Amino acid sequence: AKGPLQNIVTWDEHSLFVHGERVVIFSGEVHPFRLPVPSLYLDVFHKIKALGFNTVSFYVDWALLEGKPGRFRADGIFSLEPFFEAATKAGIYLLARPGPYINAEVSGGGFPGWLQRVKGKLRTDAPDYLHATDNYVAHIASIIAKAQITNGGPVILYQPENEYSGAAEGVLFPNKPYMQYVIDQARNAGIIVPLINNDAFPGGTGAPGTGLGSVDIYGHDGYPLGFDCAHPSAWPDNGLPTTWRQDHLNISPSTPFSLVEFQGGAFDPFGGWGFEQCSALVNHEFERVFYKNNMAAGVTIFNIYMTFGGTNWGNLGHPGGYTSYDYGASIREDRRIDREKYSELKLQGQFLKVSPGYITATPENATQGVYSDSQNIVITPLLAKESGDFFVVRHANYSSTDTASYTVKLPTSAGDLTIPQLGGSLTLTGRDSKIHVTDYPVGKFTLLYSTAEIFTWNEFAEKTVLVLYGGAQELHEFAVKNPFGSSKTAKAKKIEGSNVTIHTTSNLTVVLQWTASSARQVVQLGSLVIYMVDRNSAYNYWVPTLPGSGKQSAYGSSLMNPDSVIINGGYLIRSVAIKGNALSVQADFNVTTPLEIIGIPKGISKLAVNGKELGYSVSELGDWIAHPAIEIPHVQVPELTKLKWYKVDSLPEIRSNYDDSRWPLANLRTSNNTYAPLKTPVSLYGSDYGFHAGTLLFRGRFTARTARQQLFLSTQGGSAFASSVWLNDRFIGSFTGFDAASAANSSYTLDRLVRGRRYILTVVVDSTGLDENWTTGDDSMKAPRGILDYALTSSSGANVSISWKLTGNLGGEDYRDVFRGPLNEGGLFFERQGFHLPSPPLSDFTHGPSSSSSSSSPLDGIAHAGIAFYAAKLPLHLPAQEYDIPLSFVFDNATAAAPYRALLYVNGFQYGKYVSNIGPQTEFPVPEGILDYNGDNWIGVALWALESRGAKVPGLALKSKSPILTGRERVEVVKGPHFKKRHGAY
């Protein structure tokens, strides 16, 4: 660490500066590889920008970009270019976090499975690991360097590594040569923005002043409620972090207090609780208590992980999770922003970006009984000589769901005052926290104090507008220093409401009290207009910024206190623009509502919403009230059970006629896998042969020595995997899996054999992905997939040799579908043939009537253990130009039903792994763009019946959410290649 390398993004003790302007960085995490629809990135950025955020933080997943060692590819759906372009178009800056290690609940934690063949310890300066990362970092850091703000792009900060925070027993930590090598790779590729790290806790690793390996700005993370969503109402004792201001001053006082990841939801494992339950744990109450507690410590770089989670499509996730990565986030997996936590988070983002005094106020210790007579609340002050103070109030027991009545005694430029000055008590309801302010500037006006919280304010050309809110039935008070200027006659004017009271002191300080409710109060004091609303009303206000000009127009006039228009109403306001004498608004509506426009730019007289001009009513304050057309149609979707389903056997391996002469031989007598030394005479680890993704198969030939033989078989597929075994065409058994099992030891009898005859075992082993490697020195990502051990013995105990072949996805690291990437396909027959791709060769399938003996539908399934693949054309003709209509595939889970696993494919993209006996996921969203809403789609369902009685899908339906009338940019259909016969397939 030796200071800034450029003068665009700089920093000091208090904050980042961007173009010389101090700013609170309030960022949301988004992972581009979890939404492979380039035209929808702007949709996510619009929804994040509307929170009042200015930045997005993103990972890059190395395993998707260098599936074959030496061949970096980030094209098409893997290009970052549309992601950078969308950030520029939305006016969002970026924090780039490319790893190489990212964790992220992705397969391998970002490490490609070919790292299992690297002997040295991962995330150390073992040179085989270091050099294995060089090609990826040189490529990805050069792409991120071109997108730096110094070159007119959105990237302002770069994180090397990820939570490099501890190591296994006996491993050098911190390994400063290692850390510096990772920094040098990024510097050498042209990264000149500041480097920020993300220590897992305040451990000081990499902080400025620690010499070799130090970054520019020390950051750390926090997930104070953990990841088990079993008890969403339980906030345990000592869950609230209370030491971070002191920890910051102990570790890195010279740089801004930065929380590079702070909890925005939870991940959820197979057999977990579902993301609805995670969203109930990390809900709006969690945000108001925990996020304002971070403001109590003076956080000025603050990123919410996740803000939009997306989907672990195409096997990109790790075994510790399942297909969905909704994460319980503020923005759902299907991009809807209906959760209450979204609206609450908007209140907070909109408050910080008009409050520059928060940056320079000094956070002090938490107090009890100092700023209030009551001991039942804790108050943390942020103090300044003149530029305004902030007081974060919470229950003394942070978990409390009780209501507390209280008053405060706060320092102000007029002396210490017990507030309310006009009598009455303030209320703090259950799991709420508030920020009260003193000497808070509102343009040329000053709030001497306010108990009500600020949503926004702006100084328009002719009036200043301030929007204050409280929870319903809370009494609030604020005081405005003489707002009348010279004038002796000027008086307050009550514009709306009958609850607000007004008292003026001798020196013309105006003191207003009101009780928040559904009925807005509005008072005008000179050219200041204050709108006093309840929290639930404030949830529907929006503060789009007015564009500047040129390439960076979307970043507006400044990052703090930008020129804006205030809009009351709508499910989302995406943007405003001025076009001659017209204000043009892009908006989404999920329910009917009027739109009220507050702060009309000078000389504007026309209004348009989503490209349609409309009239409006004008209020006595000059606000516009408009009534755009909002038709929310009934949506009819095709019934899936009625499509024309085609079937193909996807376990032809077990038939007598099967030829496996094209399969790879599993003949490697040694392995470079140092984490799991071989127990078998040859390696049976998929990654040793280039297979890192999805289901594996093994074929073991032996000659029977005795009529009965005993097979011990140890398989490993990651958490919630399963494995099935046939002897020739005879089903032997399955390990049917459970959440807590990543491996299994199975013992089977192989009976009624003809001595001297050759037999072939077919062993199918699913993989739910590669493990993470979160503790440096413990090479956990190298846990192999396949067969860990076996023994075949004759009835007299003699050992019987087996010789082996194996496959994963066809071609392995020479994977066949460059467009959809290296992980999308596993090794099942129908995937190797490309039969999951659009327009499959129907002459290779069978069709027959449903509920008949020759049925070709997944609803009838199969009557024996095995694997079938089903495909059908699904035409859709939905009004996607005008409406955002989220679609999902729903499996019915039948309580008494034989176990099965299924794979869901949509236009060749795998968009679901369904595990009927483990769960929890039954509803699989797929985005518009992957689905074609005005065209033919191809759906695929693989059905793997685990038990001898077979299996079927009890029910499968397309589900739509309520249609949202939308002002988004149009979604382009992603053009995945259609089926083409594959040469050399097997």
Ligand X SMILES: *[C@@H]1O[C@H](CO)[C@@H](O[C@@H]2O[C@H](CO)[C@@H](O[C@@H]3O[C@H](CO[C@H]4O[C@H](CO[C@H]5O[C@H](CO)[C@@H](O)[C@H](O)[C@@H]5O)[C@@H](O)[C@H](O[C@H]5O[C@H](CO)[C@@H](O)[C@H](O)[C@@H]5O)[C@@H]4O)[C@@H](O)[C@H](O[C@H]4O[C@H](CO)[C@@H](O)[C@H](O)[C@@H]4O[C@H]4O[C@H](CO)[C@@H](O)[C@H](O)[C@@H]4O[C@H]4O[C@H](CO)[C@@H](O)[C@H](O[C@H]5O[C@H](CO)[C@@H](O)[C@H](O)[C@H]5O)[C@@H]4O)[C@@H]3O)[C@H](O)[C@H]2NC(C)=O)[C@H](O)[C@H]1NC(C)=O
Ligand Y SMILES: *[C@@H]1O[C@H](CO)[C@@H](O[C@@H]2O[C@H](CO)[C@@H](O[C@@H]3O[C@H](CO[C@H]4O[C@H](CO)[C@@H](O)[C@H](O[C@H]5O[C@H](CO)[C@@H](O)[C@H](O)[C@@H]5O[C@H]5O[C@H](CO)[C@@H](O)[C@H](O)[C@@H]5O)[C@@H]4O)[C@@H](O)[C@H](O[C@H]4O[C@H](CO)[C@@H](O)[C@H](O)[C@@H]4O)[C@@H]3O)[C@H](O)[C@H]2NC(C)=O)[C@H](O)[C@H]1NC(C)=O
Ligand Z SMILES: *[C@@H]1O[C@H](CO)[C@@H](O[C@@H]2O[C@H](CO)[C@@H](O)[C@H](O)[C@H]2NC(C)=O)[C@H](O)[C@H]1NC(C)=O
The Cα–Cα gap between 398 and 377 comes to 9
Q: Is 163 annotated as contributing to ligand binding? A: yes
Among 241, 470, 920, 963, the residue binding ligand X under the rule CB under 6 A is 920
SS3 for 110-159 is: HCCHHHHHCCCCCCCCCHHHHHHHHHHHHHHHHHHHHCEHHHCCCEEEEE
Amino acid symbol at 288: R
User: Could you tell me the two tokens for 790?
Assistant: 């076996």
Backbone φ, ψ for residue 140 (5° rounding) = -70, -35
CA distance 273 to 279: 11
Helices and strands in the chain, H and E counts: 13, 54
Region for residue 388 given its phi and psi (left: phi exceeds 0; alpha: psi -120 to 50; beta: otherwise): left
Q: Binding pattern to ligand GAL, positions 215-234, x when CB under 6 A?
A: ------x-------------
Contact between 228 and ligand X (CB under 6 A)? yes
Shortest distance in whole angstroms from residue 95 CB to ligand GAL: 13
Does residue 104 have a known ligand-binding role? yes
Hey, which residues between 263 and 302 contact ligand Y (CB under 6 A)? 279-280, 283, 285
888 contact, one of ligand NAG, ligand Z, ligand X, none, CB 5-8 Å limit per kind: none
Question: Which is the catalytic residue, given 261, 474, 596, 831?
Answer: 261
Q: Measuring CA to CA, which residue among 913, 919, 925 is closest to residue 897?
A: 919
Per CB under 6 A, which region of 229-237, 267-275, 449-457, 803-811 contacts ligand Z? 229-237
CB 790 within 8 A of CB 745: no
Say how far apart CA 604 and CA 613 lie, in whole Å: 13
The burial class, CB within 10 Å (0-12 / 13-18 / 19+), for 119 is middle
Binding site annotation covers 639?
no
Is 744 a residue that touches ligand NAG (CB under 6 A)?
yes
Structure tokens at 429: 């309801």
452 is in an annotated binding site: no
- Is 749 near ligand Z (CB under 6 A)? no
Query: Considering CB distances under 5 to 8 angstroms, the limit depending on partner class, which of ligand X, ligand Y, ligand GAL, none binds residue 213?
Result: none
- 738 lies in the site for ligand X, by CB under 6 A: yes
Annotated ligand binding at 366? The verdict is no
Dihedral of alpha carbons 569, 572, 578, 580, sign: negative
Considering only 24, 42, 86, 104, the residue that binds ligand GAL (CB under 6 A) is 104
Q: Which residues, including other chains, have CB under 8 Å from residue 252's CB and lie 6 or more apart? A: 204, 207, 208, 209, 217, 218
Is the Cβ–Cβ distance between 599 and 458 less than 8 Å? yes
Give SS3 for 219: strand
Is 714 a residue that touches ligand NAG (CB under 6 A)?
yes
Residues 158-187, mask of contacts with ligand GAL (x by CB under 6 A): ----xx------------------------
Q: Which of 227, 539, 731, 979 binds ligand X (CB under 6 A)?
A: 227
Catalytic residue among 29, 66, 163, 287: 163
The least CB distance from residue 315 to ligand X, in Å, is 18
Q: Which helix (H) or strand (E) holds 789?
A: strand 786-794
| Positions in 235-254 near ligand Z (CB under 6 A) | 237
Active-site residue flag, 477 = no
Which of the stretches 70-78, 558-566, 667-675, 778-786 binds ligand NAG when contact is defined by CB under 6 A?
667-675
d(CA 198, CA 774): 13
Q: Which residue type, as a one-letter code, is found at position 268?
A: D
Please give the C-alpha separations between residue 360 and each of 22, 236, 256, 355, 783, in angstroms, as whole numbers: 9, 33, 11, 10, 49
Alpha helices in 418-544 (DSSP H): 535-538
DSSP 807: E
User: Which residue, 663 or 738, has its beta carbon nearer to ligand X?
Assistant: 738
608: β partners: 584, 613
Query: Shortest distance, CB of residue 743 to ligand X, whole angstroms?
Result: 11
Q: Write the binding mask 938 to 977 for ligand GAL: x where contact by CB under 6 A, - elsewhere.
A: ----------------------------------------
- 285/860 with CB nearer ligand Z: 285
List 179, 743, 865, 872, residue binding ligand NAG (CB under 6 A) = 743
Q: How far is the CB of 7 from ligand NAG (least distance, A)?
A: 45
Q: Distance between CA 477 and CA 707 in Å, rounded? A: 90
- Which residues contact residue 587 at a Cβ distance below 8 angstroms, ignoring those fewer than 6 apart? 570, 571, 572, 573, 574, 595, 609, 610, 628, 967
Matching residue, tokens 């709030």: 447
User: How far apart are the C-alpha atoms of 85 and 90, rounded to whole Å?
Assistant: 9
Rounded to 10 degrees, what is the CA torsion of 160, 93, 333, 277?
A: 70
Which one of 61, 66, 105, 623 is in contact with ligand GAL (CB under 6 A)?
105
Q: CB-wise, 47 or 782, nearer to ligand Y?
A: 47
DSSP label of 162: S
Residue 375 contact, options ligand Y, ligand GAL, ligand Z, none, Cβ 5-8 Å cut-off depending on partner type: none
Q: Is 459 annotated as a binding residue?
A: no
Q: Which is nearer to ligand Y, 637 or 800 (CB)?
A: 637
Choose between 396 and 791: whose C-beta lies nearer to ligand Z.
396
| Contact call for residue 893 and ligand Y (CB under 6 A) | no
Does residue 320 belong to the site contacting ligand X (CB under 6 A)?
Answer: yes
Which of the listed partners (ligand GAL, ligand NAG, ligand Y, none) does 962 bind, with a CB threshold of 5 to 8 Å by partner kind? ligand Y
With CB under 6 A as the contact rule, the residue among 300, 400, 561, 937 that binds ligand Z is 400
Tell me if residue 805 falls in helix, strand or coil. strand
Check whether 102 is labelled as a binding-site residue: yes
Q: Dihedral angle at the C-alpha atoms of 319, 323, 328, 329, nearest 10 degrees?
A: 100
Is 297 a binder of ligand NAG (CB under 6 A)?
Answer: no
- 792 forms part of the interface with ligand NAG (CB under 6 A): no
Widest Cα–Cα separation across the chain? 113
Residues 6+ apart with CB under 8 A from 969: 39, 42, 43
What does the block give as tokens for 980?
């083409």
Q: Which residues of 82-95 are buried (b: 16+ CB within 10 A; e: fewer)?
A: bbbbbbbbbbbbbb
Cβ proximity to ligand Y: between 176 and 961 the closer is: 961
* Residue 234 contact among ligand GAL, ligand Z, ligand NAG, none, beta carbon within 5 to 8 Å by kind: ligand Z
Which is closer to ligand Z, CB of 230 or CB of 896? 230
Report the partner that residue 103 touches, choosing among ligand GAL, ligand X, ligand NAG, none (CB closer than 5 to 8 A by kind). ligand GAL
Binds 237: which of ligand Z, ligand X, ligand NAG, none (CB < 5-8 Å by kind): ligand Z
**CB of residue 200 to ligand GAL, shortest distance in Å:** 6
Q: Are 357 and 384 in contact (CB under 8 A)?
A: yes
Is residue 631 annotated as part of the catalytic site, yes or no?
A: no
User: Residue 778's binding partner, choosing from ligand X, ligand NAG, ligand GAL, none, with beta-carbon cut-off 5 to 8 A by kind?
Assistant: none
Considering only residues 251-290, where is the footprint of ligand X by CB under 6 A?
269, 271-272
Task: Check residue 268 for interaction with ligand GAL (CB under 6 A).
Answer: no
Among the listed ranges 204-212, 309-317, 742-750, 914-922, the one in contact with ligand X (CB under 6 A) is 914-922
Position 867 contacts ligand GAL (CB under 6 A): no
Q: Write out the residues near ligand Y by the rule CB under 6 A.
A: 279-280, 283, 285, 338, 340, 343, 403, 429-430, 432, 471, 473, 536, 539-540, 571, 590-591, 962
Question: For binding to ligand Z (CB under 6 A), which residues are involved?
Answer: 233-234, 237, 397, 399-401
Which positions make up the binding site?
59, 102-105, 162-163, 261
**Chain residues in the site for ligand GAL (CB under 6 A):** 102-105, 162-163, 200, 221, 261, 267
Binding site membership for beta-D-galactose: which residues? 59, 102-105, 162-163, 261
Residues that are catalytic: 163, 261
Binding site for ligand X (CB under 6 A): 227-228, 230, 269, 271-272, 320, 738-740, 893, 895, 916-922
